[PDB]
Ligand binder design. Structure first.
Ligand code: CLA
Ligand code: CLA
Ligand code: CLA
Ligand code: CLA
Ligand code: CLA
Ligand code: CLA
Ligand code: CLA
Ligand code: CLA
Ligand code: CLA
Ligand SMILES: CC1=C[C@H](O)CC(C)(C)[C@H]1/C=C/C(C)=C/C=C/C(C)=C/C=C/C=C(C)/C=C/C=C(C)/C=C/C1=C(C)C[C@H](O)CC1(C)C
Ligand code: SF4
Ligand SMILES: [Ca+2]
Lengths: 743, 208, 81, 221, 42
């Protein structure tokens, strides 16, 4: 009942015996290779811990140690970032003049004429321009010299070493026992308070002392090398008092509850900083302070050792109504004995969170000189969108894995899950109908507009000048947001973001940072397209999860497992009936949806937001507002978006962006190559390999390990992997070249 | 071999590795990484350590005695670090090649003996010479042991070999230290010694 | 700044909340909460010296929540008057 | 035997076999049940004793130079607060016979010899009375209990020939170690918020209790 | 050591070391004689 620390000593002794034996985990694999297929299997089941054994304790220990290893990898990656910024970057030159110099933190050695990639990025530097946005982060943190970057890189390297040692020590010397992993109340309490709340408090403390005074000096125009070091602001307090007088009293306002006196650096302004084009740092510090309070309070909910608290089992079992029987009874036991359930929930939540992060980050830019760095904005949005989509698809993959493997009503029975499995047919039928209806009305309208335009009947089109489909609800919501400050939210001076409205365009260095985004008929159509694609991919994934165990076609689908090619050509053909194949199709549909989303974002930003301001205030947008009138037809998307904006990438040859054109063509190649695997079957390839192997046998040069063709599931996996790589990489090259040449 | 279970150890209180039973001269049980576990690899490493020790002792002598000799106004050897480019009677490449063939001959003889003990002790020109040494790494003979100081009881030769290997390890560390000093500082080892002795409290690593 | 309205409000708030905690009136460490209406009796493990089973964790929690409510009330009052 | 804020689970493994056993382990770190690396109860007891010993040394030392800096011939420049000695260079430095960094390296070499020998005794008890060490190894044997090795070096005056005397002396030792330990925590936090020095802080407080903790809440530095 | 040698000769590790060496050799050859489109020696 009590929460305590439980471990076991020396479960596995570090050694090299198992290194010499490939595939120790599986007995048959340990025996040795008979055919080349063996090799692939060895990799396909490397991290499938729950299949190598059945003991929950061993699986948990392996998961914990692998987490430590991945954390070490992340720390090494961050240390590499900071070191490259410290040595192979023009960070100080960019710091002196942000808008003038293009950030760059990578140079290429001159070996085979590749030194052309070391382009003129400004600041007396030649390198490869970086769109990761690290320079903005370092500026917002208060880093001014390369000594600080060097120190951060060394510290991150040391922490990577510490993470690696922690993984080794916890798997081989002191491995926590199962009851330790199953203690979720204390885990939630610590993560809510110890990690998130305390970490946010720490970051707020840094921002108050380092970010605020340093960025204030930088924005005042002081040269970066003449600014006092970040530690001075802590030693002598009058340094802070000068910038913000309220530091003079020092803490006594905080303890007498005269918190209003801290209004100097703890504000609720909102909007953007007109000088840097980012959020007010005095708002971000207050943000993190409030977040710290909220999380430190929320991390005191679940009972651990002193009676006070909440039992998660009690909360779950206290909820149930007439429509769900005894719902929520038994879920606690399901979520504390199966790792795949937790993994699916967490993957779904993290994917949604990453998508929201992208949306909010281009909505109101949080870093200085980030809004006008168009390449950085576009790259960050697209990257986070793709990461979130992949995580969401993985959520379905692991939900199906749990359903096939760990779901068991005889021992762990849940009522809600049973009811869902009992009316899955109705669920999927209605979802199918919704998908069809959305597909017809979203895409069908595009086809209608295209046909009308081709027939010379623009008056019949679904456009802003013919038949309008105005998103009244979105317009009303953003109008309510624009009027919010001073009416419904009195304490805020500027609206949350400048996309809501209110005018007040914000520009920096002759470039538009942000301004109100209008919503019209084209926006309505593209939003409905988004809804259609999301619903179809959800249909695929949900159908894969629900029908994972059985269906009217194969009543014993669970016995075949989560991953398997088919069940033969019987019953008319049972190709791709497994849940893994449903994830395989969901990958294609997720790619479709995310590609359309990023295309919409890019074209809308270029057409109606990004651009150059002039002396009279006349905004010239990168694309002259052609989105509203050209995006309502497929021909416009093919002509005014793809054709028009591919000129930047295709011309990149002979310059520093030639690598982008090379990657454009190579991504096209890899994508077309994937179709080789996606369209064929392994029987033909095995038959051809037979003749090849005979040709080898004729010369006494045949391999002992017989070369078999790829398995069916492996063929599908290779096809989808190559398809995704090619498509995403060609879009990556297109976006980067376009926005670096035109931005 | 005389296995000494209770020999002094590099890390007092810890058991030495099984493969280090004190047979070799100068065995203190130091093998954290366990590089010498394999017997054949152990023999190869023993030979490598012996040759490294002898080369490094020669180098330490020829780097330090000459500079301790030129620091005092006795003669005028230049700095060892930059001694490679001061032009001699001929260019460096020809000297390198002529030196290479000779030392390659010697090292080939040594290699043949290492991988096949007692198979090259006889002189190929006059087959009545014969190196007396019967141990790999210890050729002996009139050439490499004219005085015959180390041909007595095995116990005496054991501690003499231990003396050899310990002096060799010291010389290896000395030569590496001279290199690292000259690259870190810009003076000679004797200059470093004199400066540090003048100011033992401040003239150290932490002066930069 | 001692005995002032803010100090008096925070005192009375924390004192009243802790007094509730020590007796019934609130979910103590040894007193379970059913649905906010009835309180059951349990032993949390940690033993108490106070006769009423008021544990150190209980007094810490009661004080903390008392300070939270006092801070909220005082800040609101000073915000409007 | 009085106990302070003990727990029923803590009372199980805290029976009184160790000096200063007041049953105070609400946290439960000394779990045996769960025993592990550095969490093993004997290691925790050893750490308590060693930390208390070092803290007693540091508490009698960090307060000394700025005491006798007021009384005696001792030079004014020589006597500084425990934080101005060069331990924290930003708060003040001093010019000794060495660089402060080579001082660290020398301190580290000596302390390393001592601490490595101590640990190798802890792991395999009695292993340091074997290998040579300019003699002196017969005095580095140990007594089975690592925290109390004894011998000619660590107990030359022969205190506590009988066992009870040793029991009560261990109790006094652990109590004084805890006192000095908490006092060093006080040193740290006082010198942080108050930034004057422990002895001068005591002197200016004992003039009158005007200098309360709440007074320093303004936090000048 | 023996097991380290064994694992150090397994297909992936051996292949990566071989290809790193080959890449370095080709890189150096190109560096010394870059922009070579014919064999002029004979
Ligand atoms: C440092 C010495 C060391 C040694 C000698 C061993 C030895 C062993 N470990 Mg172990 N381990 C170590 C460190 C070590 N480990 C560390 C630091 C961690 C924390 C991550 C772990 C965590 C760990 C776990 C969880 C497990 C083992 C297991 C094992 C045993 C099985 C074979 C094996 O190691 O896998 C194969 C050897 C490899 C080198 C595989 C590669 C793994 C690395 C992390 C890949 C690097 C990722 C890379 C950056 C990916 C990008 C690709 C890109 C480069 C193209 C074996 C006796 C397994 C076991 O005991 O089975 C019961 C077991 O499940 N270890
Ligand atoms: C974990 C976050 C964090 C941390 C580590 C610190 C740490 C520190 N703060 Mg600070 N502070 C924080 C959050 C934090 N603060 C927040 C969120 C606020 C806004 C309410 C303040 C407002 C604040 C003020 C007004 C002052 C400090 C001061 C100090 C320093 C006083 C040390 C001392 O003399 O005793 C110290 C380094 C004092 C200082 O500046 O040192 C000279 C001081 O005057 N802080
Ligand atoms: C924290 C996230 C997370 C974690 C911990 C896991 C963990 C796991 N997953 Mg999973 N998954 C995730 C996210 C995650 N997944 C996401 C986001 C998706 C959607 C794409 C999936 C979809 C998925 C499927 C379909 C399956 C799993 C499976 C598994 C299990 C075995 C995986 C394995 O080792 O096979 C081997 C792993 C490999 C061979 C590595 C693949 C290498 C990729 C394809 C190359 C990447 C290319 C690179 C990015 C760019 C090119 C570089 C190159 C040119 C050098 C394992 C427990 C398998 C299972 O059976 O579950 C039990 C399985 O069938 N996952
Ligand atoms: C590995 C051993 C070794 C090596 C490789 C060298 C190499 C060298 N020594 Mg040296 N030397 C050595 C050991 C060594 N020495 C020892 C043990 C001593 C006695 C302590 C000396 C004393 C010495 C002196 C006094 C001088 C050299 C000099 C030289 C250099 C030019 C003359 C020459 O080629 O030597 C001689 C070649 C012969 C065939 C005899 C040359 C780079 C000369 C120099 O400094 O260069 C100008 C110089 O004057 N050496
Ligand atoms: C202090 C270092 C040292 C020590 C203690 C030894 C000790 C030994 N060596 Mg060795 N040797 C050394 C350095 C050393 N050597 C160096 C630097 C080289 C490279 C030139 C060699 C090359 C060498 C060979 C090729 C052979 C030996 C052999 C031997 C053994 C036979 C007896 C003998 O006369 O040797 C030396 C006895 C001593 C008391 C040391 C003499 C030190 C002189 C007097 C230094 C004078 C200053 C110098 C000129 C500068 C003996 C155990 C022989 C052997 O193994 O027997 C079968 C043998 O084959 N040695
Ligand atoms: C092997 C014997 C040896 C000896 C006697 C010395 C002696 C000396 N070194 Mg040196 N050094 C050595 C090896 C040695 N070194 C090695 C192997 C390296 C490579 C890491 C260095 C790299 C080095 C540098 C970069 C510098 C010195 C310097 C110095 C001088 C001042 C000490 C100092 O501050 O640096 C500290 C040196 C170290 C921390 C490395 C020494 C560690 C090795 C393992 C030797 C350990 C000693 C050994 C156990 C006992 C020796 C036996 C006997 C001679 C007493 C001093 C006279 C400094 C100088 O020039 O003076 C101004 C200086 O800048 N050394
Ligand atoms: C005891 C009497 C009292 C009084 C007179 C006030 C008075 C006030 N409080 Mg306050 N408060 C009190 C007690 C009191 N409070 C206590 C006991 C607590 C502790 C729980 C709080 C905690 C509290 C907070 C955290 C805040 C206030 C705030 C305010 C001010 C604006 C709130 C408002 O009316 O706008 C109306 C507010 C809304 C309609 C909320 C709508 C927005 C939510 C988040 C949307 C729903 C999303 C959600 C996820 C679902 C206002 C003058 C606000 C302030 O700081 O003033 C500047 C503020 O944020 N109070
Ligand atoms: C997510 C990261 C993480 C987590 C959850 C844990 C969790 C744990 N660690 Mg651990 N550790 C970590 C990272 C982590 N560690 C890292 C990065 C390192 C390298 C510095 C270590 C090095 C380490 C050691 C050396 C030890 C632990 C130990 C422990 C266990 C008891 C620690 C304790 O008593 O509380 C915290 C106590 C404090 C004083 C604070 C506990 C289960 C101990 C153990 O093995 O348990 C028996 C143990 O001795 N850890
Ligand atoms: C069938 C495809 C093919 C062919 C025939 C070539 C042929 C050639 N390429 Mg090329 N290349 C290709 C594909 C191909 N490439 C692809 C796909 C890429 C993209 C990765 C490149 C990227 C590339 C670059 C960047 C460069 C070349 C260069 C060259 C020329 C350099 C010859 C050389 O290295 O010197 C001679 C090499 C040797 C003599 C090595 C063999 C000697 C051995 C080791 C010793 C044998 C001893 C007996 C050569 C005519 C270089 C060039 O300058 O072009 C003119 C150069 O810069 N290629
Ligand atoms: C037990 C427990 C468990 C349960 O269950 C719960 C709870 C209650 C939580 C807990 C708690 C605990 C605690 C609190 C502890 C603390 C500790 C400390 C403070 C230590 C120190 C400790 C401390 C220490 C060692 C110290 C040491 C010191 C020294 C050496 C010093 C030195 C010096 C000096 C002199 C002066 C100069 O000028 C400087 C220097 C150089 C610096
Ligand atoms: S074509 Fe392939 S997947 Fe389809 S039934 Fe036949 S073997 Fe199975
Ligand atoms: Ca325990």
């Amino acid at each position: 009942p009590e929460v305590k620390i439980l471990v076991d000593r020396d479960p596995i002794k570090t050694s090299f015996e198992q290194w010499a034996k490939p595939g120790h985990f599986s007995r048959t694999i340990a025996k040795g290779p008979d055919t080349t297929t063996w090799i692939w299997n060895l990799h396909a089941d490397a991290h499938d811990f729950d299949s190598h054994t059945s003991d929950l304790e061993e699986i948990s220990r392996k998961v914990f140690s692998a987490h430590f290893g991945q954390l070490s990898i992340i720390f090494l990656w961050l240390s590499g970032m900071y070191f490259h910024g410290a040595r192979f970057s023009n960070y100080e030159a960019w710091l002196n003049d942000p808008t003038h110099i293009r950030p760059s933190a990578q140079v290429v050695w001159p070996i085979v004429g590749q030194e052309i990639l070391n382009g003129d990025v400004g600041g007396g530097f030649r390198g490869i321009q970086i769109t990761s946005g690290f320079f903005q982060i370092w500026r917002a943190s208060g880093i001014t010299s390369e000594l600080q970057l060097y120190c951060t890189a060394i510290g991150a390297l040391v922490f990577a070493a510490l993470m690696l040692f922690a993984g080794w020590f916890h798997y081989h010397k002191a491995a926590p026992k199962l009851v330790w992993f199953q203690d979720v109340e204390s885990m939630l309490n610590h993560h809510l308070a110890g990690l998130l709340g305390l970490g946010s408090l720490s970051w707020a403390g840094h921002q108050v002392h380092v970010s605020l005074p340093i960025n204030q000096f930088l924005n005042a125009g002081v040269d970066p090398k003449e600014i006092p070091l970040p530690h001075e602001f802590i030693l002598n307090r009058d340094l802070l008092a000068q910038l913000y007088p309220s530091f003079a009293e020092g803490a006594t306002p905080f303890f007498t509850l005269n918190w209003s006196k801290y209004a100097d650096f703890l504000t609720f302004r909102g909007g953007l900083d007109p000088l840097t084009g980012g959020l007010w740092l005095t708002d971000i510090a207050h943000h993190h302070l409030a977040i710290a309070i909220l999380f430190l309070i929320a991390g005191h909910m679940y009972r651990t050792n002193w009676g006070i608290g909440h039992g998660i089992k009690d909360i779950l079992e206290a909820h149930k109504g007439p429509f769900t029987g005894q719902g929520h009874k038994g879920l606690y036991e399901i979520l504390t004995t199966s790792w795949h359930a937790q993994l699916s929930i967490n993957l779904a939540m993290l994917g949604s969170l990453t998508i929201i992060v992208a949306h909010h980050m281009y909505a109101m830019p949080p870093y200085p000189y980030l809004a006008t760095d168009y390449g950085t904005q576009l790259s960050l949005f697209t990257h986070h969108m793709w990461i979130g989509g992949f995580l969401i698809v993985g959520a379905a993959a692991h939900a199906a894995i749990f359903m096939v493997r760990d779901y068991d009503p005889t021992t762990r029975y849940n009522d809600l899950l049973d009811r869902v499995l009992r009316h899955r047919d109705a669920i999927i039928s209605h979802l199918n109908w919704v998908c069809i209806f959305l597909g017809f009305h979203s895409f069908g309208l595009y086809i209608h507009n295209d046909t009308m335009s081709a027939l010379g009947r623009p008056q019949d089109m679904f456009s802003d000048t013919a038949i309008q489909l105005q998103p009244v609800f979105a317009q009303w919501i953003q109008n309510t947001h624009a009027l919010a400050p001073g009416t419904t939210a009195p304490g805020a001076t500027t609206s949350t973001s400048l996309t809501w409205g209110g005018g007040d365009l914000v520009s920096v260095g002759g470039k538009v940072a942000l301004l109100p985004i209008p919503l019209g008929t084209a926006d309505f159509l593209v939003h409905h397209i988004h809804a259609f694609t999301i619903h179809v991919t959800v249909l695929i994934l949900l159908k894969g999860v629900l029908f994972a165990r059985s269906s009217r076609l194969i009543p014993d689908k669970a016995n075949l497992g989560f991953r398997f090619p088919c069940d033969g050509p019987g019953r008319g053909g049972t190709c791709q009936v497994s849940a893994w194949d449903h994830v395989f199709l969901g990958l294609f549909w997720m790619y479709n949806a995310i590609s359309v989303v990023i295309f919409h974002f890019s074209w809308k930003m270029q057409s109606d937001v990004w651009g150059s301001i002039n002396d009279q205030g006349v905004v010239t947008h990168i694309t002259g507002g052609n989105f509203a009138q050209s995006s309502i037809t497929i021909n416009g998307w093919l002509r005014d978006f793809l054709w028009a904006q591919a000129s930047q990438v295709i011309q990149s040859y002979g310059s520093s962006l030639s690598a982008y054109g090379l990657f454009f063509l190579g991504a096209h190649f890899v994508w077309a190559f994937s179709l080789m695997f996606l369209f064929s079957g392994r029987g033909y390839w095995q038959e051809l390999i037979e003749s090849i192997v005979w040709a080898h046998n004729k010369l006494k040069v045949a391999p002992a390990t017989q070369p078999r063709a790829l398995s069916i599931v492996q063929g599908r996996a290779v096809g989808v992997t190559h398809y995704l790589l090619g498509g995403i990489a060609t879009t990556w090259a297109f976006f980067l070249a376009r926005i670096i040449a035109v931005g | 071999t005389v296995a000494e279970p209770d020999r002094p150890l590099w890390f007092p209180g810890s058991t030495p590795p099984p493969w280090l039973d004190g047979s070799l001269p100068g065995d203190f049980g130091f093998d954290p990484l366990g590089l010498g576990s394999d017997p054949e690899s152990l023999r190869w490493n023993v030979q490598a350590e012996l040759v490294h020790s002898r080369w490094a002792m020669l180098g330490a002598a020829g780097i330090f005695i000459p500079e301790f000799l030129t620091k005092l106004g006795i003669l005028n050897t230049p700095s060892w670090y930059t001694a490679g480019e001061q032009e001699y009677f001929t260019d460096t490449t020809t000297l390198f090649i002529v030196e290479l063939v000779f030392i390659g001959w010697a090292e080939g003889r040594r290699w043949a003996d290492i991988l096949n003990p007692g198979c090259v002790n006889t002189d190929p020109i006059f087959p009545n010479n014969k190196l007396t040494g019967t141990d790999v790494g210890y050729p002996g003979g009139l050439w490499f042991d004219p005085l015959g100081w180390g041909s007595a009881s095995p116990q005496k030769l054991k501690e003499l070999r231990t003396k050899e290997i310990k002096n060799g390890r010291l010389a290896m560390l000395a030569v590496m230290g001279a290199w690292f000093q000259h690259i870190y500082t810009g003076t000679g080892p004797i200059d470093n010694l004199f400066a540090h002795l003048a100011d033992p409290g401040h003239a150290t690593i932490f002066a930069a | 700044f001692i005995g002032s309205p803010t100090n008096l409000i925070m005192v009375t708030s924390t004192s009243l909340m802790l007094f509730a905690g020590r007796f019934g009136l609130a979910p103590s460490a040894n007193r379970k909460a059913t649905a906010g209406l009835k309180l059951e009796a349990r032993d949390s493990g940690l033993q108490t010296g106070d006769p009423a089973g008021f544990t150190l964790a209980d007094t810490l929690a009661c004080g903390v929540v008392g300070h939270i409510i006092g801070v909220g009330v005082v800040l609101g009052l000073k915000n409007i008057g | 035997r009085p106990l302070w804020f003990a727990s029923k689970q803590s009372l199980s493994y805290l029976d009184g076999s160790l000096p200063g056993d007041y049953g105070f382990d609400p946290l439960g770190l000394s779990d045996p049940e769960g025993t592990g690396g550095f969490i093993e109860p004997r290691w925790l007891a050893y750490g308590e004793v060693i930390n208390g010993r070092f803290a007693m040394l540091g508490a009698v030392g960090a307060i000394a130079p700025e005491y006798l800096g007021k009384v005696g011939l001792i030079p004014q420049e020589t006597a500084l607060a425990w934080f101005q000695t060069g331990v924290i260079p930003p708060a003040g430095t001093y010019n000794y016979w060495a660089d402060n960094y080579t001082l660290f390296v020398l301190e580290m070499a000596l302390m390393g010899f001592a601490e490595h020998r101590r640990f190798q005794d802890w792991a395999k008890p009695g292993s340091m009375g074997k290998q040579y060490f300019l003699g002196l190894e017969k005095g580095f044997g140990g007594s089975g209990n690592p925290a109390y090795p004894g011998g000619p070096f660590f107990n030359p005056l022969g205190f506590g020939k009988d066992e009870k005397s040793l029991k009560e002396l261990k109790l006094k030792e652990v109590k004084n170690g805890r006192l000095a330990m908490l006092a060093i925590l006080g040193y740290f936090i006082q010198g942080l918020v108050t930034g004057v020095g422990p002895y001068q802080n005591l002197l200016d407080h004992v003039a009158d209790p005007v200098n309360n903790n709440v007074l320093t809440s303004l936090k000048f530095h | 050591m023996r097991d380290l040698k064994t694992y150090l000769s397994v297909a992936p590790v051996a292949s990566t070391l071989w290809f790193a060496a080959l890449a370095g050799l080709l890189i150096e050859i190109n560096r010394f004689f870059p922009d070579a489109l014919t064999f002029p020696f004979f």
